[PDB]
RNA sequence: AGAGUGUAGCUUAAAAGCACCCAACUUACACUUAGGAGAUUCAAUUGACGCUCUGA
RNA sequence: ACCUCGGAGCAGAACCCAACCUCCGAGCAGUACAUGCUAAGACUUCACCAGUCAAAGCGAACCUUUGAUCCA
C-alpha cells in the first residue's frame, strides 16, 4: 500500500509538506518549492504520518 | 484658444492601433481545433507540387503581405521553385515586405512534420534574420 | 448531473460565465470561448453567444482524430457545433487626461 | 567517407534513373490504355 | 419532427455505397486544405463568418528560365541548398510588375480607402518613393505601412518617382483632435513639373506629424495624383482640417490617384516641440482607459461568497467612521 | 470524302492546381521529408498540322 | 442482500426525473512535487452543508472514486 509522509525542507526552514509513497519504496528525497526561501530546495522524508 | 478645443475622447481609426499597442483582442478560443486563432497576424506557407507560397494574413482573414514564387519578379532568379532554396528565398522576400509593411511580429502555426521540415526551418530562419519575429507579444489586459 | 447549455444563442454573457457544461464534446469552443478541465465551455469575453456549424480540423497531436480523418473519403469534411462569444464592448477608449 | 564528385555522380544517376523509369512507366501505361 | 435541410447537406454528394472503392484522405494536410476550402465556401447555415466578418514577355520568361536551368552552377547551388537571390533586383522587379496590387491590398487592410474615399478604391500605378532625410548621410524611407518617428519626419521628405503633371498630398488619417472623421493635411504640392518637386505649388506649408502622447499610432498617407491641367486651389488646425473625400470630389475630373505611400507615427519629443513652438498650444495627453470591471448587482446577503465580495463594491479603501 | 475538332493524364485554371516517379521511414502500403520531369500543333478571331467518328 | 459515491440501462429532442430496480467499480491507483499563490465572473445533484469551472495577475517550470462537527 501507500503511506503519507512528511517531507521536511533541507534548507533549514520549518517548512514541511505531505506526500504519498509506497511503504516498500525507499525513503524519499525530492526537489520542491520553498515558499519562505522562494526557491526550489531539497526535502527529505522525516517520519511516517499514516498508512493509507 | 480655438486650437486647444480637443474632444474628451480620442478616436483613433487605424485598424492596427490597438494591435500595435498590444491591447487588441485575440480570438482566444478554438482549443479543440487546429490551428489556434489567438493571433493578430499569421504566417501561412503553402507548398504546392510546383510552387512555394507564403502569406501574412490578419486574423479577420484579409491577406496582408504575400510572397509567391509564382510571380515572375522572384521566379526569374532561382533554379527550382519547389526546394529549400525556394523556401529560403521566399522567406527573405516576405521578411523584407513585412518590414516595409510594418509587420514586425507574426505567428507561425506548423504541424509537427512541417516544423521538422528543413525547408520550413530555413524559412523561419530567413524571416527571423530579416527582422520578423515569429512570436506575437502577449495581450495587455 | 444538471449538465447542458446554460446560455442559449443571443444571450448576453459576461466574461467568465459558463456557457455549457458537457460530458463529451457536444459543443466545441469557438471564438472567445474557453474550455475547462471538465470540458465546460465558458466565455472569455463579454458579448453575445452564437452557435454555428464549422469544419472540424483536429489538432495533429490528437492521434485518434487524425486516424479518423485519414480513414475518411477524399471529399468528406467533418462538421461540429461551435459556440462563439461576439464581443460587445471595445477593449477601451482613449481619453484626454491632461492638456500639458 | 565519400567525396564531392561521387556525390554529384550519385545525384546525376538518381536524376537519370528518374527520367528512365518515368519513360518506362509512361510507355507501360500507353500499352495498357492502347 | 424533422425540418428538411435548406440546401445541400455537406458530404452528401459523395455519399455512396462504394466506400471501399472511394479514395480516402491518406494524409492530414489534404484534409486540412479541403476543410479550409469548405470554410471559405458560403453556406446556408449559421457560420463564424456571418458574425465575425505580353506573349513576347511569356516567351522571354520561358527562355530565361531555360537559361537559368541550363546554368550548371545554379543547379549545383540549388541541389546543395546554398544559392541565394538578389533582394534589391527582386524588389525593383516586383515593384514594376505586381507591386501596385500588393500596395492596394495594404491600403485596404489599413483602411485608407474606406477612410479617405468612403470605400472607393484604386491602384497605385506609379512606384512612388518618399524618404525623410535623417541628418545628412541617410534618409529613412516611407514604404506602404512603414514606421517613422516624428523626429525623423520633422523636415519635408525627398520624393522620387519615375514618371512624367503631379499633385502630392500628405494627410494624417487619424490625427484629428476634435472631429473623429476629419483629418489634418500636412503638406501639399500641386502642379509638379515632371519629376522635380522643388517647383511645386506649396499651397499649404509643410507640417511635421504630431500624434498626441498615449493617443496610439497614427497612419499618415502620401497621395500622388496624375494631373491633366493645372487648377487654382482654394499653422492653424481649423484650416489644416479637411476631408480627402470631398477634396478629391472637387478635383476628380482632372486628377486621378496613381501613387500611395503610408507610414505609422508614434509619440516623440519632436511632437512636444511641434505642439509648443509653432502650434502654440498645450499638447494633449491621452491615456487608454479600459471600461470598469463588471460586477453583478450587490446582494444584501452574498451567500457563499468570500469576504472579498464587499471589497468588490466598496469605493474608498480608507477607513470611514460615519457619525463618529 | 465529310463532321467534331485540339493546354504534360484531368480541369465552364488562366501557363496554375491536382495528378505521376524515385531516394529515405516503413515486411509492405501509406504518411512525412527531400528531390524530378513535364504542355496551350504551325501561320495570320480565322486558315492549314494531328486525334475521334461517319464511308468506300 | 442493500444503505455513500461514481459510470451505464432510464427516460428518443434544455434540465429534472422510471424511486423501488439491473449491471459495473471506488473507498483508489498512476503521475507530478508550482500537479503553486492569488483572483473577475459563473455552474451546481432541485434547501443548506458540500461539490465544480475559471479569465486577468504573481511565481515556478517549459493530471487521468468518497465522510461534517466535536475531540485528540
Ligand atoms: Mg444514473
Ligand atoms: Mg445548488
From Swiss-Prot, chain A:
Signal sequence range: none
Keyword terms: Mitochondrion, Ribonucleoprotein, Ribosomal protein, Transit peptide
Transmembrane annotation, as ranges: none
GO BP terms in the entry: mitochondrial translation
Single GO molecular function: structural constituent of ribosome
Lineage: Eukaryota, Metazoa, Chordata, Craniata, Vertebrata
Name the UniProt record assigns to this protein: Large ribosomal subunit protein bL33m
Species for this entry: Homo sapiens (Human)
Any one GO CC term of the record: mitochondrial inner membrane
Swiss-Prot record, chain B:
Keyword Zinc on entry: no
Cystine connections: none
Protein's UniProt keywords contain Ribonucleoprotein: yes
A GO molecular function held by the record: 5S rRNA binding
Alphabetical GO biological process terms: mitochondrial translation; rRNA import into mitochondrion; translation
Gene Ontology CC: one annotated term: mitochondrial ribosome
Localization annotation: Mitochondrion
Keywords, ordered alphabetically: Chaperone, Mitochondrion, Ribonucleoprotein, Ribosomal protein, RNA-binding, Transit peptide, Transport
Record text on subunit structure and interactions: Component of the mitochondrial large ribosomal subunit (mt-LSU). Mature mammalian 55S mitochondrial ribosomes consist of a small (28S) and a large (39S) subunit. The 28S small subunit contains a 12S ribosomal RNA (12S mt-rRNA) and 30 different proteins. The 39S large subunit contains a 16S rRNA (16S mt-rRNA), a copy of mitochondrial valine transfer RNA (mt-tRNA(Val)), which plays an integral structural role, and 52 different proteins.
Family: Belongs to the universal ribosomal protein uL18 family.
Function statement: Together with thiosulfate sulfurtransferase (TST), acts as a mitochondrial import factor for the cytosolic 5S rRNA. The precursor form shows RNA chaperone activity; is able to fold the 5S rRNA into an import-competent conformation that is recognized by rhodanese (TST). Both the cytoplasmic and mitochondrial forms are able to bind to the helix IV-loop D in the gamma domain of the 5S rRNA.
Protein name: Large ribosomal subunit protein uL18m
Phylogenetic placement of the source organism: Eukaryota, Metazoa, Chordata, Craniata, Vertebrata
Curated annotation (Swiss-Prot), chain C:
Keywords, comma-separated and alphabetical: Mitochondrion, Ribonucleoprotein, Ribosomal protein, Transit peptide
A GO cellular-component term linked to this record: mitochondrial inner membrane
Chief place of localization: mitochondrion
GO molecular function: RNA binding; structural constituent of ribosome
Top-level taxon of origin: Eukaryota
GO BP annotation list: mitochondrial translation; translation
Compartments, record wording: Mitochondrion
Family: Belongs to the bacterial ribosomal protein bL27 family.
Description of how the protein assembles with itself and partners: Component of the mitochondrial large ribosomal subunit (mt-LSU). Mature mammalian 55S mitochondrial ribosomes consist of a small (28S) and a large (39S) subunit. The 28S small subunit contains a 12S ribosomal RNA (12S mt-rRNA) and 30 different proteins. The 39S large subunit contains a 16S rRNA (16S mt-rRNA), a copy of mitochondrial valine transfer RNA (mt-tRNA(Val)), which plays an integral structural role, and 52 different proteins.
Protein name: Large ribosomal subunit protein bL27m
Organism listed in the record: Homo sapiens
Covered range of the whole protein: 49 to 148 of 148
UniProtKB/Swiss-Prot annotation, chain D:
Tissues in which the UniProt entry reports expression: Ubiquitous.
UniProt subcellular location: Mitochondrion
Assembly information from the UniProt record: Component of the mitochondrial large ribosomal subunit (mt-LSU). Mature mammalian 55S mitochondrial ribosomes consist of a small (28S) and a large (39S) subunit. The 28S small subunit contains a 12S ribosomal RNA (12S mt-rRNA) and 30 different proteins. The 39S large subunit contains a 16S rRNA (16S mt-rRNA), a copy of mitochondrial valine transfer RNA (mt-tRNA(Val)), which plays an integral structural role, and 52 different proteins. mL40 binds to the major groove of the anticodon stem of mt-tRNA(Val) in the central protuberance.
Sequence similarity: Belongs to the mitochondrion-specific ribosomal protein mL40 family.
Protein name (database record): Large ribosomal subunit protein mL40
Native species: Homo sapiens (Human)
